[PDB]
């Protein structure tokens, strides 16, 4: 029964620019956070928890 | 029954610029945090917890 | 039943610039923290906990 609460108050501007390039690469895993982020945030990329892939 | 609470108060500006390049590379795992981030944040990239991949 | 609490108060500006380059490399694992980060933060990259990958 866990409760939550989030609150944010910004007044001036927030510029936020991202760029990602990949040329002739075999793999590129990227995770960029936000400019003003308040609260829980979970990211999972190319993970394997149980009974993975077989070949 | 764990509860949570997050709060943030910014007034001036937040510039935030990211860039990621990859040329003819076999692997690139990247994780960049945010400019003003308050609260929990979990990231997992190319991890293996149990029963992984087989070849 | 562990509870949490986070709070932040910034007034002036927060410039935050990141850059990552990789040219003809076989591996690049990177993790950059945020400019003003308050709170828990967990990162895991290319880790192996149990029953890993086989070849
Ligand atoms: C198994 O799964 C992972 C990601 O979960 C993937 O990268 C890999 O190519 C897979 N391997 C096989 C043998 O299926
Ligand atoms: C197993 O999984 C990992 C990531 O979880 C992946 O990098 C790797 O290519 C996989 N290996 C095999 C033999 O499937
Ligand atoms: C096993 O997993 C790790 C990452 O978890 C990966 O780097 C590696 O390529 C894998 N090795 C085999 C033999 O699958």
From Swiss-Prot, chains A, B, C:
GO cellular component terms, semicolon-separated? actin cytoskeleton; axon; axon terminus; cell cortex; cytoplasm; cytosol; extracellular region; extracellular space
| Ranges that cross the membrane | none
Summarizing the annotation, the consequence of altering residue 5 to F is: No effect on osmotic stress-induced phosphorylation
How would you summarize where this protein is expressed among tissues?
Highly expressed in presynaptic terminals in the central nervous system. Expressed principally in brain.
Q: Which residues carry this modification: Phosphoserine?
A: 53
Q: Which GO terms describe its biological process?
A: adult locomotory behavior; amyloid fibril formation; behavioral response to cocaine; cellular response to copper ion; cellular response to epinephrine stimulus; cellular response to fibroblast growth factor stimulus; cellular response to oxidative stress; chemical synaptic transmission
Amino acids binding Cu cation: 16
Q: Keyword set for this entry?
A: Acetylation, Alzheimer disease, Amyloid, Cell projection, Copper, Cytoplasm, Disease variant, Membrane, Metal-binding, Neurodegeneration, Nucleus, Parkinson disease, Parkinsonism, Phosphoprotein, Repeat, Secreted, Synapse, Ubl conjugation
Q: Where in the cell is it found?
A: Cytoplasm; Membrane; Nucleus; Synapse
Query: What is stated about domains?
Result: The 'non A-beta component of Alzheimer disease amyloid plaque' domain (NAC domain) is involved in fibrils formation. The middle hydrophobic region forms the core of the filaments. The C-terminus may regulate aggregation and determine the diameter of the filaments.
Which medical condition is this protein associated with? Genetic alterations of SNCA resulting in aberrant polymerization into fibrils, are associated with several neurodegenerative diseases (synucleinopathies). SNCA fibrillar aggregates represent the major non A-beta component of Alzheimer disease amyloid plaque, and a major component of Lewy body inclusions. They are also found within Lewy body (LB)-like intraneuronal inclusions, glial inclusions and axonal spheroids in neurodegeneration with brain iron accumulation type 1. Parkinson disease 1, autosomal dominant: A complex neurodegenerative disorder characterized by bradykinesia, resting tremor, muscular rigidity and postural instability. Additional features are characteristic postural abnormalities, dysautonomia, dystonic cramps, and dementia. The pathology of Parkinson disease involves the loss of dopaminergic neurons in the substantia nigra and the presence of Lewy bodies (intraneuronal accumulations of aggregated proteins), in surviving neurons in various areas of the brain.
Q: Which family does it belong to?
A: Belongs to the synuclein family.
What protein name does the entry list?
Answer: Alpha-synuclein
